[PDB]
Amino acid sequence: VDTKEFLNHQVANLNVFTVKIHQIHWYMRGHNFFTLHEKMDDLYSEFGEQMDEVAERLLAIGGSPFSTLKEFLENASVEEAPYTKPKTMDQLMEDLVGTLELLRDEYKQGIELTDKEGDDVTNDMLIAFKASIDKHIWMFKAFLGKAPLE
Amino acid sequence: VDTKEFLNHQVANLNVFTVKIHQIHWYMRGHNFFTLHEKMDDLYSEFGEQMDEVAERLLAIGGSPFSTLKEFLENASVEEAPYTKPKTMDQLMEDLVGTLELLRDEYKQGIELTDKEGDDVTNDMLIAFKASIDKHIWMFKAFLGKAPLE
Amino acid sequence: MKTINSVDTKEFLNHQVANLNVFTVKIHQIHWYMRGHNFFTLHEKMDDLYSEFGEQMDEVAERLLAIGGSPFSTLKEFLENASVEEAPYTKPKTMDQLMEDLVGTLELLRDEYKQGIELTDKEGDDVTNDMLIAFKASIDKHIWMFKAFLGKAPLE
Amino acid sequence: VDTKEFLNHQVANLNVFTVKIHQIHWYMRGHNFFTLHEKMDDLYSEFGEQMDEVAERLLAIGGSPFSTLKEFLENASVEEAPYTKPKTMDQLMEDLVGTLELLRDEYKQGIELTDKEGDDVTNDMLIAFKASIDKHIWMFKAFLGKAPLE
Amino acid sequence: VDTKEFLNHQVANLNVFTVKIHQIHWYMRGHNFFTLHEKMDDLYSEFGEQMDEVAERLLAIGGSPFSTLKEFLENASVEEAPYTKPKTMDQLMEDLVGTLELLRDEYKQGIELTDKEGDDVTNDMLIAFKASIDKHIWMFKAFLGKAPLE
Amino acid sequence: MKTINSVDTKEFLNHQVANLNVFTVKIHQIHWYMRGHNFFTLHEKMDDLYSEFGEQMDEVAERLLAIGGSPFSTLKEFLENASVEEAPYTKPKTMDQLMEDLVGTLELLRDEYKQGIELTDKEGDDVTNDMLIAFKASIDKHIWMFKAFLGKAPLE
Amino acid sequence: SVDTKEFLNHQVANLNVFTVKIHQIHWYMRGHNFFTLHEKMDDLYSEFGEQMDEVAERLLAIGGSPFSTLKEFLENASVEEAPYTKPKTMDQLMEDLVGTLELLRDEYKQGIELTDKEGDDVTNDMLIAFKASIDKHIWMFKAFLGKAPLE
Amino acid sequence: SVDTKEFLNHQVANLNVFTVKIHQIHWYMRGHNFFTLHEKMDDLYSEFGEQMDEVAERLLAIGGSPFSTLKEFLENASVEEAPYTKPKTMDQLMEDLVGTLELLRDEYKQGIELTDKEGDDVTNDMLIAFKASIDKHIWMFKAFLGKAPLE
Amino acid sequence: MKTINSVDTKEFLNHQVANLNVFTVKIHQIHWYMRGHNFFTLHEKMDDLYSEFGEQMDEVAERLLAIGGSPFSTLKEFLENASVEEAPYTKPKTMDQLMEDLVGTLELLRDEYKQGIELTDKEGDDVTNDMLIAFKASIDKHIWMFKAFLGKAPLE
Amino acid sequence: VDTKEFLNHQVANLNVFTVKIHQIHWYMRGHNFFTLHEKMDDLYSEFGEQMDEVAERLLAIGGSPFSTLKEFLENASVEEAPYTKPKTMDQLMEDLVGTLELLRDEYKQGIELTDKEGDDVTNDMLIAFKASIDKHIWMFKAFLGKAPLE
Amino acid sequence: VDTKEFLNHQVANLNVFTVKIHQIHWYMRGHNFFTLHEKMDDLYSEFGEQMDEVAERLLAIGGSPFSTLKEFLENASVEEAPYTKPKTMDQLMEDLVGTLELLRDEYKQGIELTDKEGDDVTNDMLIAFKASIDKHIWMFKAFLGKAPLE
Amino acid sequence: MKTINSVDTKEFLNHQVANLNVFTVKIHQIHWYMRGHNFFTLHEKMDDLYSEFGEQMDEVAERLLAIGGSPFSTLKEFLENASVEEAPYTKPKTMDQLMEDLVGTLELLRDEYKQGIELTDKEGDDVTNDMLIAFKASIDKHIWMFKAFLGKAPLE
Ligand SMILES: [Co+2]
Ligand SMILES: [Co+2]
Ligand SMILES: [Co+2]
Ligand SMILES: [Co+2]
Ligand SMILES: [Co+2]
Ligand SMILES: [Co+2]
Ligand SMILES: [Co+2]
Ligand SMILES: [Co+2]
Ligand SMILES: [Co+2]
Ligand SMILES: [Co+2]
Ligand SMILES: [Co+2]
Ligand SMILES: [Co+2]
Ligand SMILES: [Co+2]
Ligand SMILES: [Co+2]
Ligand SMILES: [Co+2]
Ligand SMILES: [Co+2]
Ligand SMILES: [Co+2]
Ligand SMILES: [Co+2]
Ligand SMILES: [Co+2]
Ligand SMILES: [Co+2]
Ligand SMILES: [Co+2]
Ligand SMILES: [Co+2]
Ligand SMILES: [Co+2]
Ligand SMILES: [Co+2]
Ligand SMILES: [Co+2]
Ligand SMILES: [Co+2]
Ligand SMILES: [Co+2]
Ligand SMILES: [Co+2]
Ligand SMILES: [Co+2]
Ligand SMILES: [Co+2]
Ligand SMILES: [Co+2]
Ligand SMILES: [Co+2]
Ligand SMILES: [Co+2]
Ligand SMILES: [Co+2]
Ligand SMILES: [Co+2]
Ligand SMILES: [Co+2]
Ligand SMILES: [Co+2]
Ligand SMILES: [Co+2]
Ligand SMILES: [Co+2]
Ligand SMILES: [Co+2]
Ligand SMILES: [Co+2]
Ligand SMILES: [Co+2]
Ligand SMILES: [Co+2]
Ligand SMILES: [Co+2]
Ligand SMILES: [Co+2]
Ligand SMILES: [Co+2]
Ligand SMILES: [Co+2]
Ligand SMILES: [Co+2]
Ligand SMILES: [Co+2]
Ligand SMILES: [Co+2]
Ligand SMILES: [Co+2]
Ligand SMILES: [Co+2]
Ligand SMILES: [Co+2]
Ligand SMILES: [Co+2]
Ligand SMILES: [Co+2]
Ligand SMILES: [Co+2]
Ligand SMILES: [Co+2]
Ligand SMILES: [Co+2]
Ligand SMILES: [Co+2]
Ligand SMILES: [Co+2]
Ligand SMILES: [Co+2]
Ligand SMILES: [Co+2]
Ligand SMILES: [Co+2]
Ligand SMILES: [Co+2]
Ligand SMILES: [Co+2]
Ligand SMILES: [Co+2]
Ligand SMILES: [Co+2]
Ligand SMILES: [Co+2]
Ligand SMILES: [Co+2]
Ligand SMILES: [Co+2]
Ligand SMILES: [Co+2]
Ligand SMILES: [Co+2]
Ligand SMILES: [Co+2]
Ligand SMILES: [Co+2]
Ligand SMILES: [Co+2]
Ligand SMILES: [Co+2]
Ligand SMILES: [Co+2]
Ligand SMILES: [Co+2]
Ligand SMILES: [Co+2]
Ligand SMILES: [Co+2]
Ligand SMILES: [Co+2]
Ligand SMILES: [Co+2]
Ligand SMILES: [Co+2]
Ligand SMILES: [Co+2]
Ligand SMILES: [Co+2]
Ligand SMILES: [Co+2]
Ligand SMILES: [Co+2]
Ligand SMILES: [Co+2]
Ligand SMILES: [Co+2]
Ligand SMILES: [Co+2]
Known part of the structure; x- marks a missing residue:
């Protein structure tokens, strides 16, 4: 492992994570809905900016960021799963x-x-x-x- | 085809498209770099908001938006390709x-x-x-x- | 008149002027009387809705004016025409009931x-x-x- | 009349008054239309805020505000009348x-x-x-x- | 008529109209001067923006907007006249x-x-x-x- | 000592300088240690209260200055004079308890x-x-x- | 440079009389154009008050000494003032x-x-x-x- | 209500004399604290000018008639003014x-x-x-x- | 007619009211029809110029009013008096030509x-x-x- | 010492320090009053924010911040003293x-x-x-x- | 001396002057430090803007601005000296x-x-x-x- | 001194004060003299860089002050110490060369x-x-x- 490989792995992770944040944002239910629905927008923005910063730092050290969903799924260690049955807010x-x-x-x-x-x-x-x-x-x-x- | 299926297809398309916008944002080179690099941030924000609006309209009509990269790739008609060899700004x-x-x-x-x-x-x-x-x-x-x- | 049988854009819009005035007062009822752990969030949320549907009401009334109509403009008329229902707050209601x-x-x-x-x-x-x-x-x-x-x- | 009864009477008055302000806002005609139409929006906001502050002060002293049109009409001393015949700006x-x-x-x-x-x-x-x-x-x-x- | 022809006709109309708005803005006299002088600035901006939106919609459907005073006068149905004698505010x-x-x-x-x-x-x-x-x-x-x- | 026996305005205001300094620290205690489903709303709400009562404290102290008084200005003095009580956070408290x-x-x-x-x-x-x-x-x-x-x- | 200094100081006096006149109009006006012109007088009061400060501070910067009392303003202003005794129409104001x-x-x-x-x-x-x-x-x-x- | 009216009008006069005095200080001050106190006088000028307008308009709202000329301000103010003749220290101002x-x-x-x-x-x-x-x-x-x- | 023979200030200013109205329309012509790699920058730049010269035009017209003049205020008058020239957009022009x-x-x-x-x-x-x-x-x-x-x- | 103990010591120090800043803010006299009175408000905000950041970092590493005046006095190395006699601005x-x-x-x-x-x-x-x-x-x-x- | 030569001389002067403003900003001491330190930042900005406006006016009249420290020193009439011994605020x-x-x-x-x-x-x-x-x-x-x- | 052999934080920071003053003047040189189709974008971009590296320069100088140093503060000293090079603009340079x-x-x-x-x-x-x-x-x-x-x- 070198720095370029590590950063690119995180480009992949952060793209999976921001999509997961949206999954939670969209499907959540419960009494804390209004607060946590908005909170997920804050996290989406923040980790989207982390992702862009990681990718552009990788560019600046001579690397080549992953830039397709296929590459993100091939490389991410963050896991994702389709939303099929109802989850509680705590589970999300x-x-x-x-x-x-x-x-x-x-x-x-x-x-x-x-x-x-x-x-x-x-x-x-x-x-x-x-x-x-x-x-x-x-x-x-x-x-x-x-x-x-x- | 009904409205729910159509909107979900566009949730998938718009997630592939925003990642493509980032690909262009990151890899572009040429004399128009500074203008088009920023322009891609504008498009990323705009089509990200389209995506959220489509997903939440789908929620509001009783549907269930795709919410994983796997589902987006399974359903999108927008195409993506890894960035391997240099492209001109016009090609992008x-x-x-x-x-x-x-x-x-x-x-x-x-x-x-x-x-x-x-x-x-x-x-x-x-x-x-x-x-x-x-x-x-x-x-x-x-x-x-x-x-x-x- | 009954909106479901309504025949006339002017009549329909005026009916909604009445409805929206009953609704914004109901939003205040909920805003004022709510209790429970979600108080701080939903109290503010009702302020958002109060402003939004008050703006809807003004837009409806002024669209009615612009097509040659005459908006209801008294509590008496609002009560005479609204299909939105209201009730005085007498006994405690849970946040879910509100x-x-x-x-x-x-x-x-x-x-x-x-x-x-x-x-x-x-x-x-x-x-x-x-x-x-x-x-x-x-x-x-x-x-x-x-x-x-x-x-x-x-x-x- | 104690303080609670007085404040509730003004909750009723202020709801009749803000509707009257809208009546004037909507129906006014004449050369001072543009200025006074906007001025009525200022007053509508101001006396709506007075009404909420009165109601919430009543809550804080252990009272229960009127909260229906029926109650406002039964208790208000402010008078209202439907707009039936043309009124001059001065009359309004x-x-x-x-x-x-x-x-x-x-x-x-x-x-x-x-x-x-x-x-x-x-x-x-x-x-x-x-x-x-x-x-x-x-x-x-x-x-x-x-x-x-x- | 088709859509392109209609939109171009309105490019012409709106350019005649914004000049008329300026005519009124400049030449008005009377007690309502201050309010209506400013009001014409509001209209001037608004209908100038309508004009640009119409022209750019025309471009986006493959049309070619009129873009000279000569063409505007050849195509507008809005009429104009020089200010040659006093007009009342009501006339304007x-x-x-x-x-x-x-x-x-x-x-x-x-x-x-x-x-x-x-x-x-x-x-x-x-x-x-x-x-x-x-x-x-x-x-x-x-x-x-x-x-x-x- | 006791506000019910406050001899004069200067002594009363100084007692509240002490009280408000103990109170703003208690607000931070709640802000920091709270847990539960209302965390995000109430954690932010405590910041609002901390600012507001901090401003009350400065206003009280500077009003005391302006009438010729001398505000308490050390933790030792605040503890010697406050009637607001404080306790270290030891065993967990529920959000409702806080x-x-x-x-x-x-x-x-x-x-x-x-x-x-x-x-x-x-x-x-x-x-x-x-x-x-x-x-x-x-x-x-x-x-x-x-x-x-x-x-x-x-x-x- | 004394002629420029005297001119600027004369205008310090004028503008102080003028801003008070603008307030007179602002306060006492009545009639249908009240709301527009009442606010318009606030715009004028601010603008000519700023002219006055700019004039006085330009006078300072060229070595002069601005009038700085109501007594001096009245002794020097050519702008006239009068107490408000009987109501005036908006057009008269x-x-x-x-x-x-x-x-x-x-x-x-x-x-x-x-x-x-x-x-x-x-x-x-x-x-x-x-x-x-x-x-x-x-x-x-x-x-x-x-x-x-x-x- | 005439005593309240007379009091408020007396303060219209006072505050007009006071804001001119604030300008006097603003313009003529010299010394090491110049930059801070020159700006501080602008804050005071704005604040007491707003007090003055609030006083005058409260007087209007209770049925009174505000003084509205420099002559009237001088005839009624208890705040004193003096021309700036010899330099004053910052502490004196x-x-x-x-x-x-x-x-x-x-x-x-x-x-x-x-x-x-x-x-x-x-x-x-x-x-x-x-x-x-x-x-x-x-x-x-x-x-x-x-x-x-x-x- | 010709500014080099302008008899007086009023005539000169009115000539520029005419010129600036022709010019702002030309700015829109360029804004709308431009193509090429500098499009995004220059399309926005034309909006800046349109606003600026529109403001110059209003300032010129209102200065003319304030000195007792009467500004041209119709397209017909602008075309009769402008020395700025205009032409319909027919054959394509490069960005440099524009x-x-x-x-x-x-x-x-x-x-x-x-x-x-x-x-x-x-x-x-x-x-x-x-x-x-x-x-x-x-x-x-x-x-x-x-x-x-x-x-x-x-x-x- | 370990990191948790160090951070908690600074929670105590910073609470003593912000009160000292207020002491100076309130009691200062001299020609530099206006500038330094406002400057102490700047410092009060800044070191109050340091204090909250230290306490919340301590929370995030599993610690428990001091949260009473009694604890602050028991643990601070910053010293305080009542204002009992005039001090010059230089002394403060x-x-x-x-x-x-x-x-x-x-x-x-x-x-x-x-x-x-x-x-x-x-x-x-x-x-x-x-x-x-x-x-x-x-x-x-x-x-x-x-x-x-x- | 023609206008072009004059403007270029002031490009040189203003670059020496802004550096002097920084010298004063950095080295000043005394009771008026906080006020005058900030005031020097205001002046630095202002005279830097004068310098750019002078240079760009020179460009617009067909001239060529000095654009090196060497040229500024060779042409400026503003004097500079290194800060070697303490100066009072008044001296600065x-x-x-x-x-x-x-x-x-x-x-x-x-x-x-x-x-x-x-x-x-x-x-x-x-x-x-x-x-x-x-x-x-x-x-x-x-x-x-x-x-x-x- | 040569940074590559530099031994002393104070010496290093002062060297960069000199460098950053030469650099910001160079940014202005480019800002002023540039020509070509990317003029509007890069002219503004140089303003961004001028502000940013001017702020770097002030931060370096004031960090040097805070560790007990004495920043260079004359053009003479900047030229005596900078390793950044400058040259007068004599013959045309393309945008790429700049x-x-x-x-x-x-x-x-x-x-x-x-x-x-x-x-x-x-x-x-x-x-x-x-x-x-x-x-x-x-x-x-x-x-x-x-x-x-x-x-x-x-x-x-
Ligand atoms: Co990996
Ligand atoms: Co539930
Ligand atoms: Co909540
Ligand atoms: Co919230
Ligand atoms: Co970013
Ligand atoms: Co980016
Ligand atoms: Co860091
Ligand atoms: Co790997
Ligand atoms: Co599909
Ligand atoms: Co190239
Ligand atoms: Co470009
Ligand atoms: Co750009
Ligand atoms: Co959104
Ligand atoms: Co959303
Ligand atoms: Co629509
Ligand atoms: Co499908
Ligand atoms: Co009905
Ligand atoms: Co029926
Ligand atoms: Co149809
Ligand atoms: Co249909
Ligand atoms: Co509205
Ligand atoms: Co309305
Ligand atoms: Co629509
Ligand atoms: Co439609
Ligand atoms: Co009653
Ligand atoms: Co009429
Ligand atoms: Co409110
Ligand atoms: Co409320
Ligand atoms: Co009060
Ligand atoms: Co009271
Ligand atoms: Co009753
Ligand atoms: Co009348
Ligand atoms: Co169709
Ligand atoms: Co046609
Ligand atoms: Co009239
Ligand atoms: Co009017
Ligand atoms: Co108005
Ligand atoms: Co536009
Ligand atoms: Co456009
Ligand atoms: Co639409
Ligand atoms: Co009429
Ligand atoms: Co006590
Ligand atoms: Co739980
Ligand atoms: Co405060
Ligand atoms: Co304070
Ligand atoms: Co009060
Ligand atoms: Co509970
Ligand atoms: Co004279
Ligand atoms: Co000023
Ligand atoms: Co001034
Ligand atoms: Co000028
Ligand atoms: Co004289
Ligand atoms: Co008249
Ligand atoms: Co008296
Ligand atoms: Co006011
Ligand atoms: Co006023
Ligand atoms: Co009060
Ligand atoms: Co008297
Ligand atoms: Co002294
Ligand atoms: Co001519
Ligand atoms: Co091409
Ligand atoms: Co203008
Ligand atoms: Co105009
Ligand atoms: Co000029
Ligand atoms: Co070319
Ligand atoms: Co390590
Ligand atoms: Co310790
Ligand atoms: Co001193
Ligand atoms: Co000072
Ligand atoms: Co200051
Ligand atoms: Co905070
Ligand atoms: Co915190
Ligand atoms: Co760091
Ligand atoms: Co000393
Ligand atoms: Co020379
Ligand atoms: Co000293
Ligand atoms: Co500039
Ligand atoms: Co420049
Ligand atoms: Co000029
Ligand atoms: Co001149
Ligand atoms: Co020479
Ligand atoms: Co001295
Ligand atoms: Co070196
Ligand atoms: Co060497
Ligand atoms: Co180390
Ligand atoms: Co190392
Ligand atoms: Co800085
Ligand atoms: Co600095
Ligand atoms: Co850092
Ligand atoms: Co580090």
């Missing part, structure tokens, strides 16, 4: 949180890799993204009645 | 225009279908989207040195 | 607007037709979202 | 001014009542509303060519 | 209203024409423009002390 | 502000009297809304 | 406003010639800009009165 | 400003008692709000001078 | 405004003189920038 | 600068600590806060006529 | 005022020159700049306790 | 900032290190975009 937020934790943990691996390779800019970028992910994990775990690392 | 804009024309022509079919079924709201929505697509076709054809229907 | 009343009235307006859409189409009043379709688009979106709050599908 | 503004004077004088009674009962917050709220009403009375009387209190 | 507003009614009635013909030809986008555009014209006719007739269709 | 603590403190401030309104009216300090009434107006509105969240009437 | 605008126009024209003769390009340019606005106001308020700008 | 703020504070206190006695709740409330701001300014400008607010 | 036509018209207006500056200076109309200088300043900047687009020096 | 600013230097030096220790523990996000947060403190130290030292590290 | 403001006076007096020569040559646009531009310089001279002299021209 | 000069200078700054990033890391100046990384991130993005304009890959 557990799927969201689980994907946030996955991104956190993979970003930590990219932070270590970019440090080893001496790519200070990419390292810094990933740290800033992790800071936001860690905050989201605390808040969505709190919604679920749980501690952030529980 | 021809791919863009060709997809705009496809969406125009399929939206016209949805306009006829929703009129036949008496779904006035969906009909009106599609007409408004076609108005913007037709304007884009004129402008991007003009960039290419061509008439809008040439 | 939202069910809201959704039921949205469905009534949706269905009456669809009657007006057909009527204006047949009479060739393209502007009024287009106006009502835009209003229905918003109502349909609200019905989906408030049904979702209630744990239900939009047309369930 | 005379009706507006007459109602502003009614509200002014009733708010003065409410100011005295709340001072007697020790409800400092409600007292302060009513004084602020009267301040605006007094200003409107001066300006609309001036429009009519008259002194504010003549 | 009667001229404005008459031209609004002419445009309303021609847009109605274009609405019927585009419906028959199946040009849903152009049909929708013309309806939106008629909606605004109908509102202006009510308001300016009210200024003149008249009912909208009087 | 909101009950918030409402209880709002009621305490309401009732002490009422004492200060009566005191300043007696002393003829019209400006301070008016300031306290405006603050009470907001507190009364908050009590209604947070009681509604809890499913209760405002004075229940 | 607008005629007074227009007359004062014409007075300022004509005195500024004198100041434009004076500053050109003295070679004070900055002050000359400032006065031309003010006259441009005054000329526009004269056209618009004359039109309100049913009149041509210079008739 | 701020002492004059503070003294005038204290004058307005104390007269408003009288007006607050008067309107309470006459039962004019609206005017009473307006004056209290103005006094609140004046009291804050007195604290801040006294602090600038190194002094306590009431010392 | 920009050459634009620059040529800017140069015409520059040179006529210079005549009006000299005329108003002679007549002592300081306000109109100043207005025309400000307009020339913008035209000179546009000539530099559009000549640069064409690969040329401003006065080449 | 010397107290401010001394506390900024204390915070700078403790943040340096936390930067080293979080680096050693591998908490990249917390490390990055503390560096950004130190950057602002270092700038303030230069500017307030300049106010006092001193070099930044004098 | 005296240097600023002295340079403003230099620019004022040179712009006056340029105003005379452009009037002689008939360059009305350049003449007008220089007068506007002098207007601002004259205002700054009054205000900074006032800061120093002096009359504007003494 | 953009090649821009890109070459961006690459020089990138590579010198990387030297400063390593130096500040070794010295333990975390704040200066973080500042330089943020600046490099922007420079790297510009290099990609301007190379794309030139038809080249970012590191080609």
